[PDB]
């Protein structure tokens, strides 16, 4: 994918139940695997901001639940550094449902998104109300 300007620690590993913050009907999704991630022996799949993960909808509507979907993490509590040396951290972790190409299934994103994801996937930025 296109490189991000910031250095992102892959903070969320497989099994994490993240709140889903769009209007698709998925409330909580559990990370199953990370796309484009090859691991090593004994290492759980890891994801930071800007990564696309295969997720399972654990809470939400009956249509969303039990579905294998693609999501992009837009907020992470683990601090990441911008190129100019400033460290950024969010109050929670948050993801949004997308396709393979990066288009969000939802139409509006409640909460701030990271500028890194906003630039890597421009449609997430337009869908989000504010980009931090």
């Amino acid at each position: 994918m296109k490189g991000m300007r910031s250095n992102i620690p892959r903070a969320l590993n497989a099994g994490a139940q993240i709140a889903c913050v769009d209007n698709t009907g998925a409330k909580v999704v559990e990370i199953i695997s990370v796309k484009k991630y090859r691991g090593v022996k004994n290492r759980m799949p890891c994801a930071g901001i800007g990564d696309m993960c295969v997720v399972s909808v654990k809470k939400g509507t009956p249509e969303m639940r039990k579905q294998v979907l693609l999501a992009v993490v837009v907020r992470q509590k683990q601090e990441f550094r911008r190129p100019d040396g400033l460290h950024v951290s969010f109050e929670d972790n948050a993801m949004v449902i997308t396709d393979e190409e990066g288009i969000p299934k939802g139409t509006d994103i409640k909460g701030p998104v990271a500028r890194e994801v906003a630039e890597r996937f421009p449609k997430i930025g337009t869908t989000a109300s504010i980009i931090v």
């Binding site: 249509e63 579905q67 393979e100």
Partner: protein, 730 residues
């Protein structure tokens, strides 16, 4: 008076200016920015205020077309170019340059008088190119070649000036060969082309430079020089003094025939009516006359605008408030938006006599391919119907249980994309009965699915569905009640073919004057009494109430009707939909009170009887046919035909014109599978088939047993069926 602000003014009166009017099209291949040079003809060339012109590829009425190197559908506009100090109205009606586009391409060409050529450098007369030259030849739409972006040959491949344009001199020669071989007579009749004589241009649409001997000379930058300038790298500065638009326009005015000339041309061949009425005369010999002789080319729309059904004013005049019929019925609607496709849209107006375009709105019930005219349209161009449905579908599955959710959106949505895909989307096991009637239809959507959304699903084999029907007049069968209190003596019999066609068209409507309908029925043939007793119709089957005396019956009609309907949904023989079957209630015997007249007693009786009736009436089955318009190369006929005939295909027309043998044969869908497959070997890899729902005919009696057998198991039904007596269990 901001550009188009002036145009508007001139245009409103320009309408009745055929002399300068220039309704034309553009035909060639794709991936040659053909629809993009046409974007720049007027929108690109700022025919409106520059900010509001071609900035965001808005020119074409069908905005979505954008640019892929060729027309997408049949969008429309206008451009008032000046040539030798005169503002000619070059209504750009760029014609779709493809092959699949068919019965609609006909009228999408009738909208113009000349389709124009565009072939990028050493691309040549591609298979498609020649295909659209063939289609062009039909609608007498004279062309002019526009060899786009020769840059390839130039800068990239560097073929010396002379050579460079000699390759095109030959290409021109091939366009002449096209207009010779194909239709030899056509040639001399203006259709001839030539760079020298001026009826051929060239130039990069993406770089907007362009020339042609006339242009060449006038500008003083001969093609040789232009080569030198391109090669050098200044194609943009070249464009400046050789405006891509200009050339094209110049030719449309001068060389490219002004509408008037071949105003007739098209009609006769394209029109299937009397080309000698007021309307006919006007449309042919460039005149207005013809009581609002508009032609619904493509039923369109626009947000808070009107049903902008396109139709260049090939004859007549426009005004706001004209009760206009249609080529389907007599709707009669206020025609408020008699405007002209102008700027990057369709400038709505009123006063538009014959000459330019004539997209009328105010409607909401016609068909893409109608010919809406105030005049009582006896035989309008594509006088056609539309009553049809796919009958051989498949069972879209899911290679991965993870794509199911997605698949769900994919398929439920697809309706939007195409409503001809009646996606019978079951819900339990989910064997999604994705519409279809033939192999074409099958793959048609195949890709769509795996491209407009992309899913990991698959398909099964053709669902060989049909329409159950009978063939023999039976003898009154009594349908008793569960509680053995009531009774109904109903008889069944074949539905007359004339009647069949009648209701297949739909004219025979329930919401219709009795007296009136009655006459129609008698007309067809059904005797007076029987024809008057008709209560209801389902699908293409009629229930006749030819009884007299039974008290409290019409208060039961509901029930009995429904009973009938039910049977009509599910055959008594193959459990398949029933069509073209006439049922007639002779007698009855209902219980006095209402207690013993509930649905639970009525409905069975009716069902029972109707069904049994069918059984006894030598119930067979119908089968859809699909007219195979197959444009095999003229020469090729032996093999071409042999194929069809062998696949039990009742041969129809051979259509031998110039170098094109279009052998239709309304090939029974039964054996209408792998047409292209066979073709590639039968005709040494040379044939262009295309199919269309030929209609429901009788499945060959000989193979009935087999057919039924199959159907029975395919659905999962007992080998034998309740033979008469048993289903009629007294």
């Amino acid at each position: 008076m901001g550009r188009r602000k002036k145009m508007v003014e001139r245009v409103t009166t320009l309408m009745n200016d055929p002399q300068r009017i220039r309704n034309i099209g553009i035909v060639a291949h794709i991936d040659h920015g053909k629809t993009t040079l046409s974007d720049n003809l007027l929108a690109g060339a700022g025919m409106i205020s520059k900010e509001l012109a071609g900035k965001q590829l808005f020119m074409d009425s069908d905005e979505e077309e954008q640019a892929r190197g060729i027309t997408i559908d049949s969008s429309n506009v206008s451009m008032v170019h000046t040539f030798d100090n005169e503002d000619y109205l070059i209504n750009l009606i760029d014609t779709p340059g493809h092959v699949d586009f068919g019965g609609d391409v006909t009228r999408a060409m009738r909208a113009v008088d000349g389709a124009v050529v565009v072939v990028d450098a050493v691309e040549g007369t591609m298979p498609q190119t020649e295909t659209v030259l063939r289609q062009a030849l039909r609608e007498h739409v004279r062309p002019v070649l526009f060899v786009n972006k020769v840059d390839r040959l130039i800068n990239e491949l560097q073929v010396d000036s002379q050579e460079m344009q000699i390759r095109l001199g030959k290409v021109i020669d091939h366009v002449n060969k096209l207009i010779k071989n194909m239709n030899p007579e056509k040639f001399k009749a203006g259709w001839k082309v030539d760079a020298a004589a001026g009826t051929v241009a060239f130039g990069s649409a993406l770089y907007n430079w362009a020339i042609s001997v006339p242009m060449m000379k006038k500008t003083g930058v001969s093609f040789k020089d232009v080569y030198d300038y391109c090669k050098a790298g200044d194609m943009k500065s070249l464009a400046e003094k050789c405006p891509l638009h200009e050339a094209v326009l110049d030719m449309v005015i001068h060389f490219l025939p002004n509408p008037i000339e071949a105003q007739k041309g098209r009609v006769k061949v394209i029109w299937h009516g009397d080309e000698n009425t007021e309307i006919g005369k006007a449309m042919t010999h460039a005149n207005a006359e013809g009581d609002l002789a508009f032609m619904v080319t493509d039923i369109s729309v626009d947000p808070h605008a009107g049903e902008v059904a396109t139709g260049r004013l090939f004859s007549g005049s426009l005004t706001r408030g004209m009760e206009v019929f249609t080529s389907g019925s007599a709707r009669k609607s206020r025609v408020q938006q008699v405007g002209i496709f102008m700027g990057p849209e369709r400038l709505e107006v009123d006063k538009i006599p014959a000459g330019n375009i004539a997209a009328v709105t105010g409607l909401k019930e016609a068909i893409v391919g109608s010919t809406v005219t105030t005049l009582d349209g006896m035989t309008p161009f594509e006088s056609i119907r539309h009553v049809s449905e796919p009958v051989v579908t498949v069972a879209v599955e899911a290679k991965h249980t993870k794509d199911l959710p997605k698949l769900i959106e994919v398929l439920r949505q697809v309706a939007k994309e195409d409503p001809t895909l009646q996606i019978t989307l079951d819900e339990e096991t989910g064997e999604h009965l994705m519409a279809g009637m033939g192999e074409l239809h099958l793959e048609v959507i195949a890709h769509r699915i795996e491209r407009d959304k992309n899913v990991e699903i698959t398909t099964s084999k053709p669902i060989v569905v049909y329409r159950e029907t009978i063939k023999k007049k039976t003898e009154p069968i009594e349908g008793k009640s569960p509680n053995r209190h009531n009774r109904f003596y109903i008889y069944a019999e074949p539905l007359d073919t004339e009647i069949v066609s009648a209701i297949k068209e739909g004219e025979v409507s329930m919401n219709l004057p009795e007296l009136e309908r009655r006459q129609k029925l008698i007309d067809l043939g059904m005797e007076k009494e029987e024809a008057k007793g008709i209560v209801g119709i389902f699908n293409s089957n009629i229930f006749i109430d030819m009884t007299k005396g039974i008290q409290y019956l019409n208060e039961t009609m509901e029930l009995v009707l429904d009973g009938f309907e039910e049977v009509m949904r599910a055959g008594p023989l193959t459990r398949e939909p029933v069509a073209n079957v006439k049922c007639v209630l002779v007698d009855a015997k209902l219980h006095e009170d209402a207690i013993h007249r509930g649905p639970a007693q009525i409905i069975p009786a009716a069902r029972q009887a109707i069904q049994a009736g069918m059984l006894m009436a030598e119930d067979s089955l119908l089968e859809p046919y699909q007219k195979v318009f197959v444009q095999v190369p003229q020469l090729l006929m032996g093999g071409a035909t042999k194929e069809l005939q062998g696949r039990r295909g009742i041969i129809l027309n051979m259509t031998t014109e110039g170098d094109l043998a279009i052998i239709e044969a309304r090939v029974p869908v039964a054996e209408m599978f792998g047409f292209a497959g066979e073709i590639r070997s039968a005709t040494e890899g040379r044939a262009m088939w295309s199919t269309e729902f030929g209609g429901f005919d009788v499945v060959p009696s000989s193979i009935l047993n087999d057919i039924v057998g199959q159907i029975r198991e395919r659905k999962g039904l007992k080998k034998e069926l309740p033979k008469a007596s048993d289903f009629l269990s007294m």
